[PDB]
Coordinates of C-alpha atoms and ligand atoms in Angstrom, one line a residue:
X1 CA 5.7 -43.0 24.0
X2 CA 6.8 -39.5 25.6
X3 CA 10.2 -40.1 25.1
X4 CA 10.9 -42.8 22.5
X5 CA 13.3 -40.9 20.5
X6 CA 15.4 -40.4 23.8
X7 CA 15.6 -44.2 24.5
X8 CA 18.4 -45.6 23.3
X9 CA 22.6 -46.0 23.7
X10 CA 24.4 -42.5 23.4
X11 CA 28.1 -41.9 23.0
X12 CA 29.6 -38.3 23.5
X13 CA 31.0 -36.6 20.1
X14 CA 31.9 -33.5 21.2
X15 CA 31.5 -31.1 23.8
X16 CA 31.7 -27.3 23.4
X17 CA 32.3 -24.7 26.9
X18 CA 32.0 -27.2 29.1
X19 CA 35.2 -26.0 31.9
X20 CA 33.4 -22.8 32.2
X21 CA 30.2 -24.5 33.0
X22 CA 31.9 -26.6 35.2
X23 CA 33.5 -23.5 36.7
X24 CA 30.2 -21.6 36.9
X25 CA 28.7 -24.5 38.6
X26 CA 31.7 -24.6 41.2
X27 CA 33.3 -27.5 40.2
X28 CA 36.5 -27.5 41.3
X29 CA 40.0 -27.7 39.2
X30 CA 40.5 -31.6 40.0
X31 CA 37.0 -32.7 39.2
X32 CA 36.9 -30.2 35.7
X33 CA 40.0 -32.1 34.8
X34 CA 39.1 -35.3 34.9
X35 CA 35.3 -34.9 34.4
X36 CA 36.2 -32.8 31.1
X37 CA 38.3 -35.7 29.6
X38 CA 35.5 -37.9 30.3
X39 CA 33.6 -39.7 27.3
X40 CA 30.6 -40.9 28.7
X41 CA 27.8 -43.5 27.3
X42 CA 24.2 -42.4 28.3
X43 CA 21.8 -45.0 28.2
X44 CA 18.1 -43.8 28.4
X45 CA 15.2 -46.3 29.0
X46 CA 11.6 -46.1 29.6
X47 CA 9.4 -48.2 32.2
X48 CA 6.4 -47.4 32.1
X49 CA 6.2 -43.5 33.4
X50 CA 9.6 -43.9 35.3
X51 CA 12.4 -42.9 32.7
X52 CA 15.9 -43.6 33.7
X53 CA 19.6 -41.9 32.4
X54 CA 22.7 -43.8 33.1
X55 CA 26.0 -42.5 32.4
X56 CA 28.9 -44.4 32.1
X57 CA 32.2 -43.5 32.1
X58 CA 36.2 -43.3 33.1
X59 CA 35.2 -40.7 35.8
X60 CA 32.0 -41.7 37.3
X61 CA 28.9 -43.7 36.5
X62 CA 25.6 -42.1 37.6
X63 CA 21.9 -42.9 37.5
X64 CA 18.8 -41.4 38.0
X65 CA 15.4 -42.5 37.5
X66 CA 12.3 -40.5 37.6
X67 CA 8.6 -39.2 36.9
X68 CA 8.2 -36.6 34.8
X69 CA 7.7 -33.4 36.7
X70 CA 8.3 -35.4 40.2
X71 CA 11.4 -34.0 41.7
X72 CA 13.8 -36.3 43.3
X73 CA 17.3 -36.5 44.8
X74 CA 19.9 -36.8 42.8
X75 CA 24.3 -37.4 43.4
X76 CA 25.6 -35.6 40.2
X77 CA 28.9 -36.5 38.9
X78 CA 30.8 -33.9 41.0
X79 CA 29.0 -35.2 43.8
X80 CA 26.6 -32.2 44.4
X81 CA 23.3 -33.2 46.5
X82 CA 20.5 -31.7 44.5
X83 CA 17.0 -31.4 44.1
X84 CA 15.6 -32.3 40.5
X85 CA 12.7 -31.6 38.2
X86 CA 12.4 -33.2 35.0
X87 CA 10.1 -32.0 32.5
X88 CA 9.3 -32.0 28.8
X89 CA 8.9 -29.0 27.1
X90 CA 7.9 -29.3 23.5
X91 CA 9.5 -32.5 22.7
X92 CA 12.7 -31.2 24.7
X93 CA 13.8 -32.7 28.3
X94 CA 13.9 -29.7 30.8
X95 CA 16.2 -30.8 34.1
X96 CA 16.5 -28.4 36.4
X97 CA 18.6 -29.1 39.7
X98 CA 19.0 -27.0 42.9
X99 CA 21.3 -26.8 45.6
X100 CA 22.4 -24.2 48.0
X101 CA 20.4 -21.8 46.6
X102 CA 21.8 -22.2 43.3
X103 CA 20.0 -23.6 40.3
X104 CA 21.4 -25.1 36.5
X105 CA 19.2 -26.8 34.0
X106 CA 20.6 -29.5 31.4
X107 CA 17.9 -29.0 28.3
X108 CA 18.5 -32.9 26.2
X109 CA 16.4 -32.3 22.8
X110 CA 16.7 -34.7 19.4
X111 CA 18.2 -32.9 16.5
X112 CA 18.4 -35.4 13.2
X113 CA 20.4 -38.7 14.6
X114 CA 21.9 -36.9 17.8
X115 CA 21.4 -35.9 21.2
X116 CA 21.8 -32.6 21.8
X117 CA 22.8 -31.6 25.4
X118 CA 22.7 -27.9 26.6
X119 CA 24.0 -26.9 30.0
X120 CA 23.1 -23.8 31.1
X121 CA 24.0 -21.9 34.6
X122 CA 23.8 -18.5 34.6
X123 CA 24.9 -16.5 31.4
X124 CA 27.5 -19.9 30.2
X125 CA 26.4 -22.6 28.3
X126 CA 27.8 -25.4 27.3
X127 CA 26.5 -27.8 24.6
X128 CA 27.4 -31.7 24.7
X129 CA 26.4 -33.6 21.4
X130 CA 25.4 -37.1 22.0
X131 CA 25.5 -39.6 18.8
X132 CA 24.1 -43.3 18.9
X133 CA 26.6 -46.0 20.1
Ligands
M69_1 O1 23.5 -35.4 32.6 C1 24.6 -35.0 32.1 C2 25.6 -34.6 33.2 C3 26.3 -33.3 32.7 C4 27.4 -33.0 33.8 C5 28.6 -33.8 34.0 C6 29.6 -33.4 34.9 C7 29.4 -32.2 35.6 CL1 30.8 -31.9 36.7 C8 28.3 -31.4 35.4 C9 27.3 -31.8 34.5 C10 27.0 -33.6 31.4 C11 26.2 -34.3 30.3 O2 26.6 -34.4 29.2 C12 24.9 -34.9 30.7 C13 24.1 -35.3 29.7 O3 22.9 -35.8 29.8

């Protein structure tokens, strides 16, 4: 029942930041031009423990399924290898990914009928607002 307000079909609204996430990430200027025009559809389900987030979109389609606090591998859109962690903190998702020493965490938390999406690396963050499709 963990995440049952997560599950569902998600469209992207808006997005707020997001090139200088991108850029603090070390996304490159091809990939941040593309990836930033992108309007992707999450779709969150729930199997038992194993919760999986598929994106969908012009740019890329990704999936991961996981356990909560069970790290795994992940390919993110900008094809980084990393190493995740999913958590929930108080009712709010707590992904944290590393890779090459580096870290960034994407924090997904319900806020009245959205999906709010904060991505965090360093000092910039970028929040992505998710409404159902
Ligand atoms: O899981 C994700 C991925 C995240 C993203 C996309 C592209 C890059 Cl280059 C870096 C990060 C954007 C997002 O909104 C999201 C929502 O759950």
């Amino acid at each position: 029942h963990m995440c049952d307000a997560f599950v569902g079909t998600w469209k992207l609204v808006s997005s707020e930041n997001f090139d200088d996430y991108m850029k603090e990430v070390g996304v490159g200027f091809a990939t941040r031009k593309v990836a930033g025009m992108a309007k992707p559809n999450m779709i969150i389900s729930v199997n038992g423990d194993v919760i999986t987030i598929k994106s969908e979109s012009t740019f890329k389609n990704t999936e991961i399924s996981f356990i909560l606090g069970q790290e795994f591998d992940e390919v993110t859109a900008d094809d980084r290898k990393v190493k995740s962690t999913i958590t929930l903190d108080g009712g709010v998702l707590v992904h944290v990914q590393k890779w090459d020493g580096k870290s960034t965490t994407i924090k997904r938390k319900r806020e009245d009928d959205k999906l709010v999406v904060e991505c965090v690396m360093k000092g910039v963050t970028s929040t992505r607002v998710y409404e159902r499709a």
